[PDB]
C-alpha cells in the first residue's frame, strides 16, 4: 500500500478496497474503486473509463465535410454536440464564415440539447438516488398535493392524480417485476425525504420521461430526427421559405410555429416542475452541500459557448462565459486559449495508450491515439480484473489538464466562471437560489450544487432559446433567409494545409475538436470531451483528475452499498462514451 | 398477468438507440416500462451498480432462462482480447454470450448491434464485430439505423407483445413492416428526382423549394428504412425533409460507401 | 293574433313578438321568434332555418360511389355521419356487404365524431350558457382547486393553475377587446354557479379547445383528416398491413398504436373534465329539470347505431337501440321502419318549398325538394322579415312526422328508448345520474336532462372506441386483414334500378339518406337529418316540432336577453346546414 | 399591446372551415384568439346572440373601420334575391358587403369562399357565388380546400400578425407558402407513379404497399395544396397516405370535373 499527498488530499490505499462495475445510470463503460478506513471514509478513489471505439483513427482520410455524422456518433446522449464542434473546426480550418440564420439555428440546436438532457439527467439518471421510489408507496395523496402546491404553480397536483400514480407504481410491483427498480438502494439512511416528497418526485419522473421526447421536436425540425440530427459545413441544411412558392419544401412559417410551441412548453415544465424538485432536494438534502466539493473549489474550467455575433467566438460575442480558474483563486479569471500548446495538454502515463514520453502532455494538434491495453500488475488477469493498479495505466480516458492544473468542468464549472466575472442573470439566479436554501454560496461547491446548477442552467437554456428564436424572425422579417455559405464548400477551394479548433460547452462542460486538413483529407482529428476531463485518470505527478478529488473523504453509511459514491458520480453526469470517443 | 421479460445490454455503442426508444410517442416509453414489458435490467435506466447490479443480471437470467427477450444495444469489440469493453471486469463479449444463451430471441437494435456501425468504419481499431458474426445459434431481428426511429422500435415492441410472434423479416434479418421498401420508394421530393430538379448548392433556389437532394449525395436510393414514410419524433420530420440527404445509416457500412455528399 | 291548441299546448301569438336572429353557437342559420305574455313568459315559439344550399338536387346524375364526399359536405360539425350513412345507403341499395374490419373502422369513426362533437358542444357552443365567464375574474384560486378536486381526480387542479388562467382572462379583457366575450349576459339572474365554479368552468372551456384537436387524429389514420374524411362504398379505403413488405404503405402496427393512444386520452378527458362538469352544471341549476321538457315526456325516436355484426342494421346487431315512443307511452317503444311509407313523412305547408299538394306529407323515396321562397306577409318585405308569418311558410326546413306525430331525436330521445328497453347499462347509468342529483327520473325529459345526455352518451362512446378497436386488433391477430369488398364496385355489376336507405344515430338524433339508382347514377336523393326533426315548423294539423315545444311555457327574467331561449335551443345542439342540407 | 381586430362571418356553409381552424396545433387556437388576433364577432363561438350580436358586430366595423381582418367562411348566394341565406330578416349579402367596405383584407377561407365549393356544384340551386366576385374592391386572399388545412389557416394568421403583410399570392390569389406547388409534385407515392405501381382495385396487393391512386381517380396531379407535405391534424395524415385519392378539393369547380374514381 502507497501514501502520497495531491491538492490537499491524502491518497491512501491502504485497506478496504470496494469496486463498482459497472456504474449505471450513466452513459456507457465506467468502473469505480475506492478504498475506506475503518471510519467508513473513502481515503482513495479510481476512476476507470471501460470502453474505447477510436473516432480520432476513423477520422484520419476522410473528407472533412463528412467529419460531423461521425463523430456525432461520439454520443447519442449529447446528440449534436460534436457535430457542433466539428462544423465549427472544419470552418476555423478552411476560413468559412457562415450566415447568422445558421448560427442562430445552431444556438437553437444546442439550447435544445442543454434543456433535453439536463432534465432527463436530473429525473431518469440521478433522480433515484435522491427519490425513494418505493417509499413514495407510503405517501398519502392529499399530502403529496399539498406539499407540491406549496412548492409550485404547475397544474398536476390533484390528490387524485398523486393517488393513481401511486396505485400505477403499486400495480407495478405486485407482482414481483420490480424491473429498474429490482434490487435498489431503497431505505437507505441517506434517504431523507419524506414519502409525500418521494410520491412528488416520482410523479415528475414519469411527466419529464413522457415530455422529453417533445423538446427534441426542435431538432426534427431544423436538423431531421432526433437522435442524431444532420448539420452542414457552411451552416445548415435546412433552407428557409416564409413566402415565395414551394415553402412546402423547406422551413415555413408553419414549421417556425411549432418549435415556437416547442419553446414554450419547454420552458414551462423546466420552470415549475424541475426547478422546484431541485430546490426541493437541497432543502431536504442540504448536508450534500458540503460533500463531494472535490476541485470545485480549486480549479474549474469553461471553453464558454453561444456566440451570439456570428462567427466571432470573442468573449464579447459567447452569452455563456469562458474562462479558467486556478487555485482557488475565483478574483482571477484566466482567458482560454485553445491554440496555445502550453495550455490544454493530455497526459496518457495513467491510461492505455503509448506516447513517445508518458511523462509529458501532447496538446491535441501533437495528440496521438494509439490504443494499448496494458493493465499491468492487476489483482486477477488482464482479461479479469479484480482490482486495477491506478499506480499504473488503469483507463482508456486521457488525462486533459489546463496548464498542467487538474480541472473541473460542467454546469458547476461554468456556474462558478459565470459568477465571477459578473455575469449579471447568473448572479441573480445563484444568490436567490441559495438564500431559498439558507446555504451560503460555497454550498454550490458539492454534489448538490452541481444537480442544482444543472437546474438552474436547464432554465438558462430555456430563455435563451427564446431569444434565438426571436433573433431568427427578426431577420426572417427583413428578409434575411441566407442558411449556408457554399463559397468555399468544394475541397478544391480550401488551403492545402489548414487547421482549426471547434469549441463549445456541452451538457457536460467544455468540448473541444482539433483538426488539420491536408490535401483535401483529414489529417488529424484530436477530441477533447468534457467528461475526459471530469473522469481524467492521475498524472505524472500523481494529480487527481475531478471525480476521484470528489469522491476523497466521502463517508459511507453501508460499505456494500455504493449509494455516496453513486450519488457524486451521478452529480457530473458522467458520459463514458464521450469520454473516450 | 406478467409482463415479459426484457434484457437489455449495452456494448461498444454512444446510446442513441436507448435514447430513441425513450422518444416514443405512441405507446409512451413510461407506458412501455410499466404495463406492456418487464425492463429487467438496463444499465442506462436501473437503479442498482456494481454488485447489486450484477445480482439483478444473475437472478433474471436464471429465474426467466429461456423466456426473456434480450435486447442488445452496440457490439462487442474482438480486439485486445476483448477489453476494448469492459464489464465487471471481464470482455464485454463474455456478458453478451450469457445473456444470448438463456434468451427466446435476441433484438439487435440499431446499426452498431446489427452491422457494426461508425466504430466498425475504416480501420476498425477495436474490431468491433455484430452480434449475429458472435451469436449464431439464436433468432436475431436487425432493427438497423443510426438510431433506428423511435416509433418503429415501439410498434416492434408492441407487435411481438400483442401478436406474440417475432415480426416476420426479410434476408438480412429485417422486419419486413418497416424494412421492405427504400427511403427513395416512398420518397416525397421523387417527383423532383424523377423531372430533374436537383439541389446543386445548399440554400440555392432549388434547396429553398424542397427539390431532390440526389446531387447532395442523397443515398436514399439504396437504404431500407421507414423515414419517408412514418418519420421521426411523432411524425415531425426526416433528414430529406429538413434538406439533408439520406446518409444510408440503416445500411451495412454506410459509413464506407464513399463521402456523404458523393454519388 | 290568435290561439289554438295542440300537444297539450296553448299557442297563442298575442302579446310581445321577440326576435332572435342570429342564434349563435350554433352551426349554421337559424331565427327563432317568440311571444310572450304579461307574466314574461313563452306562448308561442317559431323556429326558422334561414339558409338552404339544396344538396338533393345536386346529388341527382352522380356516381352513387361518389355521394359520400358530397353529402359528407352537408356538415363539417357533425363530419362524417353523412359520409357513413351514404356508404350505407347505397350498399343497401346494390347489395353490398362489407367485411368485418370496414364495419368495425366505420364504428370507430362514428364514435370518434361522437366524442368529439359532444365535447365541442359542451364546452364552446352550450358552456357559455352556464358559466359565467366574467364573473370568473370574482373567483378564489385556492376556492377553485378545492371544488375542483372535490369533484374529480383530474391532475390539473393546482391553485396557481387556476390563478394562471385567472390572470389570462383578466389579461384578455383589461384592454377592452373581450372578442367571443364581448356583449354577453353575464350577471343575468340565470346564471346561478358561484365563481369558483366559474373559474373551473371556463379553465375546462380552455382544456377542451385544445384537447379535441387530438380526437379527431383518430379519423385522420383511418379517413386521411379530418374536418371530412374520407370513405368508399364496399368499406374502406385504409388497407392493412400489418407484417409484410410495404407495411409503411397502410395501416400499420405504429398506425394503430398511434390510434390506441388517442382512444385511452379520449376517455380520461371526457370522464375526468367533461362528465364531472355535466353533473356541477346539474347540481347549481336544478330548476332547469322542469324547464324545456317540450316533446321529450310525449313522443322520441331513434334509427338506432353501430351495428356490431357486419352488414346486420337489425335489433341484436345495433349497439344504440333504436325504437319510437308517442303519446307519452314509454311503455310501449315502437319499431321503426324506414321503407314504410307510412312512418317517415315530410311536410311542406309550413316550409319555403312547392308539392303538387302542400297537405299530405312525402316518405323520402317520395320525397321532392322543390325551393320557393314564399315568406307571405312579414310586416316588411321579401328581403326584409320583421315578423316572420308562421300561419304560413316560414322555414327552409321541411317538418318531418312519424305516423303523423312530432318527434324529439338526440341523446335524450335515445337515453329514453334504450332506458325502456331495458338496456342494462343505460338504465343503471340513469338511475345513478338522477340519484346523484337528487332528482326524479323525469327530471330527465328536461333542457338540463339534454344536456346531461349528450355528457353520458361522450362517456358512453370512449368506452365503445376501446371495444371496436379490441374487435379489430382480435380479428388482424386472427389474419383477418380485409377492408373493402369490391364484387360490385363496377357499375356493370349494379341492378339496373335499385334503392336503398342508410341510417344511423348521429350525435344530434336519428338520420336517413333515402337513394334511388337508375342506369348507374343517383336518381333521387333524399335526406332527413336530425336537427331536420328537432327544428320543424308546423305540420298541417299545426302540430309543433321538438323546439317549439320544447321554449312554450318558459319564462324569461329579461325579455330583451334571450338567455333561457339560447339555454333550451343550445341544449338541442342545432346543426342548420344538416337541417336544411 | 391591442391585438388585430378580426371579424368572422358565416354564408352558406357547412362550418368545416371554423372546425379546420380549431384543430389548430400550433399554434394552438386557445392562443391565436386570447393571444395573437381580437376574434370579435363569429357566430359559431361568440357569446352574444341576436339584437346583442347585431351590436357586436355594428360596434366593430365602426369603431375599427378600415383596421379589421375580415374572415369569410361560405358564400352569398344570388337565388331568391339573396333569401337562401338570411341574416337579421335580411340577404346574408349585405352583411358580406357591409363588413368588406370596412375591411382592410378580406381572408375567403375554403373552397366556399374562394370558388363556390359544394352548393355551387351542378346545378347550384342556390346561385352560389365566391367572394371575388361580389367584393371587387378590397385585398382578398383565397385559402381553399375543404377545409384547408388546420396548420395552414393559422400559419397564414400568423404571417399577416407577425410579418404585418399579407401572403404574396399566385394569379388567383393563393398565397404562394402553401399552394405554390401540388399535391403531386410532394407526394411520397410519386416513386409508384414513376414506376406505373397502382393501385387497381379497393384493397388489393398494390393498396397494401402503398401503391400510387392515380387510377383509382387521385386528382393530386391537377391540385394545389400543401397536404402533401404540411400533412393534416398535426401531421398524422393526408388523403393518399390514408388511401383514398386526392379528390382536388382545393381547386376551383372540383366536384364538376367527372368522378372522383375517373380520370
Ligand atoms: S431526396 Fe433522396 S430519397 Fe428523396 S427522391 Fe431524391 S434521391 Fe430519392
Ligand atoms: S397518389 Fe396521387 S398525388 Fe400521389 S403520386 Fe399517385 S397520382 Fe400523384
Ligand atoms: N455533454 C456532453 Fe458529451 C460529454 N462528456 C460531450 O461533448
Ligand atoms: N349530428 C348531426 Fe348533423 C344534424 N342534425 C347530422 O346528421
Ligand atoms: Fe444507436 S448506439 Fe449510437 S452509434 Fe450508430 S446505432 Fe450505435
Ligand atoms: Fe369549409 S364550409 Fe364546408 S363546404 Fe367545402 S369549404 Fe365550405
Ligand atoms: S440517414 Fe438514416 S434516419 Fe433514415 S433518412 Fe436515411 S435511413
Ligand atoms: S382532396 Fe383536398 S385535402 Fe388535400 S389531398 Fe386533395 S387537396
Ligand atoms: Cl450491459
Ligand atoms: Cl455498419
Ligand atoms: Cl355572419
Ligand atoms: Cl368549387
Ligand atoms: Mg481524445
Ligand atoms: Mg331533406
Ligand atoms: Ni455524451
Ligand atoms: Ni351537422
Same mark, same amino acid.
Given at each position: ?581 | ?77 474482438? /480486439?485486445?482480447?476483448? &477489453? +476494448? ?15 444470448? *444463451? %438463456? ?69 438480412? /434479418?429485417?422486419?419486413? &413492416? +418497416? ?15 424523377? *423531372? %430533374? ?67
Amino acid at each position: 500500500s502507497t501514501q502520497y499527498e495531491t491538492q490537499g488530499y491524502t491518497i491512501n490505499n491502504a485497506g478496504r478496497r470496494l469496486v463498482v462495475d459497472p456504474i449505471t445510470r450513466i452513459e456507457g463503460h465506467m468502473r469505480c474503486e475506492v478504498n475506506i478506513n475503518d471510519q467508513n471514509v473513502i481515503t482513495n478513489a479510481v476512476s476507470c473509463g471501460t470502453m474505447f471505439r477510436g473516432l480520432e483513427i476513423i477520422l484520419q482520410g476522410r473528407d472533412p465535410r463528412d467529419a460531423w455524422a461521425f463523430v456525432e456518433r461520439i454520443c447519442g446522449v449529447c446528440t449534436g454536440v460534436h457535430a457542433l464542434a466539428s462544423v465549427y473546426a472544419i470552418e476555423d480550418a478552411i476560413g468559412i464564415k457562415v450566415p447568422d440564420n445558421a448560427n442562430i439555428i445552431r444556438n437553437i440546436m444546442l439550447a435544445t440539447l442543454w434543456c433535453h438532457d439536463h432534465l432527463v439527467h436530473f429525473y431518469q439518471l440521478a433522480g433515484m438516488d435522491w427519490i425513494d421510489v418505493l417509499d413514495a408507496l407510503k405517501a398519502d395523496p392529499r399530502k403529496t398535493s399539498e406539499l407540491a402546491q406549496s412548492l409550485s404553480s404547475w397544474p398536476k397536483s390533484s390528490p387524485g392524480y398523486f393517488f393513481d400514480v401511486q396505485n400505477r407504481l403499486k400495480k407495478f410491483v405486485e407482482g414481483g417485476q420490480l424491473g429498474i427498480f429490482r434490487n435498489g438502494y431503497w431505505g437507505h439512511p441517506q434517504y431523507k425525504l419524506p414519502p409525500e416528497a418521494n410520491l412528488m418526485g416520482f410523479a415528475h419522473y414519469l411527466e419529464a420521461l413522457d415530455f422529453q421526447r417533445e423538446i427534441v421536436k426542435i431538432h426534427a425540425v431544423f436538423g431531421g430526427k432526433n437522435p442524431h440530427p444532420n448539420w452542414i459545413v457552411g451552416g445548415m441544411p435546412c433552407a428557409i421559405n416564409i413566402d415565395e412558392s414551394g415553402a412546402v419544401g423547406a422551413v415555413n412559417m408553419e414549421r417556425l410555429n411549432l418549435v415556437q410551441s416547442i419553446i414554450t412548453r419547454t420552458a414551462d415544465f423546466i420552470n415549475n416542475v424541475m426547478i422546484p424538485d431541485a430546490l426541493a432536494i437541497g432543502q431536504f438534502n442540504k448536508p450534500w452541500s458540503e460533500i463531494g466539493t472535490g476541485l470545485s473549489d480549486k480549479c474549474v474550467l469553461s471553453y464558454g459557448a453561444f456566440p451570439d455575433i456570428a462567427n466571432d467566438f470573442g468573449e464579447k460575442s459567447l452569452l455563456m462565459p469562458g474562462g479558467a480558474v486556478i487555485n482557488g483563486d475565483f478574483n482571477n479569471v484566466l482567458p482560454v486559449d485553445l491554440v496555445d500548446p502550453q495550455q490544454v495538454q493530455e497526459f496518457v502515463d495513467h491510461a492505455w495508450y503509448r506516447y513517445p514520453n508518458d511523462q509529458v502532455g501532447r496538446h491535441p494538434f501533437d495528440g496521438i491515439t494509439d490504443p494499448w491495453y496494458n493493465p499491468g500488475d492487476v489483482k486477477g488477469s488482464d482479461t479479469n480484473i479484480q482490482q486495477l493498479n491506478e499506480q499504473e495505466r488503469y483507463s482508456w480516458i486521457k488525462a486533459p489538464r489546463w496548464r498542467g492544473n487538474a480541472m473541473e468542468v460542467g454546469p458547476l464549472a461554468r456556474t462558478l466562471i459565470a459568477y465571477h466575472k459578473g455575469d449579471a442573470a447568473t448572479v441573480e439566479s445563484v444568490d436567490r437560489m441559495m438564500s431559498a436554501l439558507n446555504l451560503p454560496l460555497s454550498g454550490i461547491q458539492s454534489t448538490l450544487g452541481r444537480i442544482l446548477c444543472r437546474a438552474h442552467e436547464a432554465q438558462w437554456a430555456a430563455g435563451k432559446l427564446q431569444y434565438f428564436f426571436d433573433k431568427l424572425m427578426t431577420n426572417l422579417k427583413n428578409g434575411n433567409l441566407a442558411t449556408a455559405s457554399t463559397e468555399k464548400w468544394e475541397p478544391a477551394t480550401w488551403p492545402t494545409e489548414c487547421r482549426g479548433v471547434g469549441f463549445t460547452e456541452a451538457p457536460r462542460g467544455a468540448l473541444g475538436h482539433w483538426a488539420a486538413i491536408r490535401d483535401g483529407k483529414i489529417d488529424l482529428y484530436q477530441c477533447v470531451v468534457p467528461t475526459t476531463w471530469n473522469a481524467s485518470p492521475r498524472d505524472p505527478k500523481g494529480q487527481i483528475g475531478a471525480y476521484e478529488a470528489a469522491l476523497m473523504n466521502t463517508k459511507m453509511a453501508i460499505p456494500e452499498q455504493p449509494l455516496e459514491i453513486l450519488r457524486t458520480l451521478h452529480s457530473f453526469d458522467p458520459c463514458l462514451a464521450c469520454s473516450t470517443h | 398477468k406478467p409482463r415479459i421479460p426484457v434484457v437489455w445490454i449495452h456494448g461498444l455503442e454512444c446510446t442513441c438507440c436507448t435514447e430513441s426508444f425513450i422518444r416514443s410517442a405512441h405507446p409512451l416509453a413510461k407506458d412501455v416500462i410499466l404495463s406492456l414489458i418487464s425492463l429487467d435490467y438496463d444499465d442506462t435506466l436501473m437503479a442498482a451498480a456494481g454488485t447489486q447490479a450484477e445480482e439483478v443480471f444473475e437472478d433474471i437470467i436464471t429465474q426467466y432462462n429461456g423466456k426473456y427477450i434480450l435486447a442488445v444495444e452496440g457490439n462487442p469489440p474482438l /480486439g485486445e482480447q476483448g &477489453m +476494448f469493453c469492459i464489464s465487471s471486469g471481464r470482455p464485454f463479449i463474455e456478458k453478451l454470450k450469457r445473456a444470448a *444463451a %438463456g434468451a427466446s430471441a435476441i433484438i439487435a437494435w440499431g446499426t452498431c448491434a446489427s452491422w457494426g456501425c461508425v466504430q466498425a468504419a475504416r480501420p476498425n481499431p477495436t474490431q468491433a464485430t455484430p452480434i449475429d458474426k458472435v451469436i449464431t445459434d439464436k433468432p436475431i431481428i436487425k432493427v438497423p439505423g443510426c438510431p433506428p426511429i423511435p416509433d418503429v422500435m415501439s410498434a416492434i415492441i408492441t407487435y411481438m407483445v400483442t401478436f406474440d410472434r417475432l415480426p416476420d423479416v426479410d434476408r438480412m /434479418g429485417r422486419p419486413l &413492416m +418497416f424494412y421492405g421498401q427504400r427511403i427513395h420508394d416512398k420518397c416525397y421530393r421523387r417527383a423532383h428526382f424523377d *423531372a %430533374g430538379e436537383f439541389v446543386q448548392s445548399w440554400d440555392d433556389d432549388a434547396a429553398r423549394k424542397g427539390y431532390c437532394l440526389y446531387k447532395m449525395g442523397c443515398k436514399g436510393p439504396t437504404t431500407y428504412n421507414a423515414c419517408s414514410s412514418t418519420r421521426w419524433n411523432d411524425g415531425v420530420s426526416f433528414p430529406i425533409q429538413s434538406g439533408h440527404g439520406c446518409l444510408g445509416c440503416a445500411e451495412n457500412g454506410f459509413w464506407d460507401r464513399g463521402s456523404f455528399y458523393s454519388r
